[PDB]
Design a protein around this ligand. Structure first.
Ligand SMILES: O=C(NCCc1ccc(O)cc1)c1ccccn1
Length: 342
């Protein structure tokens, strides 16, 4: 079990002004630290956020959070469930800012809600330094869905934070699961993120901001546009037929028009990953993986995801014999990979 700690700086808050926080399980024999960002879509205006507060309140408030959480998948401490990093220090950071981890705005006389996702990450890092993170060798910032996009938006800021505070020996890396989307034509979203960024006072990485310039920062929420600008090592996990991608594309599972649409989506996703040297992209219809207990089961070209992440670690000590890091399926239809989840 990971134990809850509410942030000591109570001005860093969830949407409703309650304190943000993190769940922690220390492993004092280890100098590896895994900080996982939870997902769960977002909200982009007052009416839309009001509805989320009514029926998704744990994603907006800490008032009802439980004292403990069980670590699963990559957050498990059991070698059989987590062959990759079972002995690491484990941190789960709840998503209670509804801003894809981008916001830097407090609740005030003019703001019903606080959107502080980018500041929550930095405050968690600061408070962990006094609980052992100061001695770390590797900080892996991981996340799923909106949290996977949050990794891409925040990994270089964490690296700069630690350099500026005087911890040059901590190697910061990212793991982005199910947060790599296409701004494509629907079969039958960009306006929501354009509105949301203004509502949240959302912030994106500096090099990406300088490329796209004022008014166009929404571009940096799409993985294939923000990833080339990043300096920290980032491993990308993305199903080729992601269920959230197909939902916003208005695809519900076939005649020729839809067959061609689905095949083109997989081809485009595979193209965006061609120059991503650390990646895992199976030809499956699914969504999220790294904190699911059976994340050990899927394989690409005979290599599992925990193995690919271990090979990535070795590469950061040129290609390794029998230990690949770039694993993208070539077959063109969901479940042409026999190891896909059922
Ligand atoms: O919301 C979507 N796009 C707006 C930007 C965005 C927001 C959040 C995020 O995590 C990544 C990008 C979207 C587009 C395609 C498939 C699914 N969702």
């Amino acid at each position: 079990d990971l134990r809850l700690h509410l942030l000591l700086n109570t001005s860093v808050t969830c949407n409703d002004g309650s304190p943000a926080g993190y769940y922690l399980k220390e492993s004092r024999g280890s100098r590896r630290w895994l900080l996982f960002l939870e997902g769960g879509w977002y909200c982009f205006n007052r009416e839309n956020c009001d509805s989320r507060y009514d029926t998704m309140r744990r994603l907006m408030s800490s008032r009802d959070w439980p004292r403990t959480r069980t670590g699963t998948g990559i957050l498990s401490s059991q070698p059989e469930e987590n062959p990759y990093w079972w002995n690491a220090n484990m941190v789960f950071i709840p998503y209670c800012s509804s801003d894809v981890w981008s916001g830097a705005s407090s609740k005030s006389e003019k703001n019903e809600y606080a959107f502080m996702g980018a500041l929550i990450i930095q405050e968690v890092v600061r408070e962990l330094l006094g609980r052992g993170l100061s001695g770390a060798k590797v900080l892996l910032l991981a996340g799923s869905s909106a949290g996977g996009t949050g990794v891409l938006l925040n990994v270089d800021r964490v690296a700069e934070q630690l350099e500026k505070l005087g911890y040059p020996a901590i190697q910061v890396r990212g793991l982005a699961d199910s947060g790599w989307f296409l701004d494509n034509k629907q079969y039958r979203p960009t306006e929501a993120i354009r509105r949301g960024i203004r509502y949240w006072n959302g912030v994106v990485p500096e090099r990406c901001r300088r490329q796209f310039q004022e008014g166009e920062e929404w571009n940096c929420f799409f993985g294939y546009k923000v990833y080339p600008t990043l300096r920290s090592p980032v491993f990308v996990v993305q199903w080729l037929f992601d269920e959230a991608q197909l939902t916003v594309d208005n695809v519900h599972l076939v005649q020729e028009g839809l067959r061609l649409y689905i095949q083109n989506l997989g081809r485009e996703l595979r193209h965006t990953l061609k120059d991503v040297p650390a990646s895992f992209a199976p030809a499956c219809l699914s969504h999220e993986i790294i904190i699911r207990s059976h994340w050990t089961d899927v394989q690409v070209k005979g290599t599992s995801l925990p193995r690919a992440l271990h090979c990535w670690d070795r590469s950061l000590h040129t290609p390794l014999k029998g230990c690949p890091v770039h694993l993208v399926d070539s077959c063109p239809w969901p479940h042409c990979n026999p190891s896909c989840p059922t």
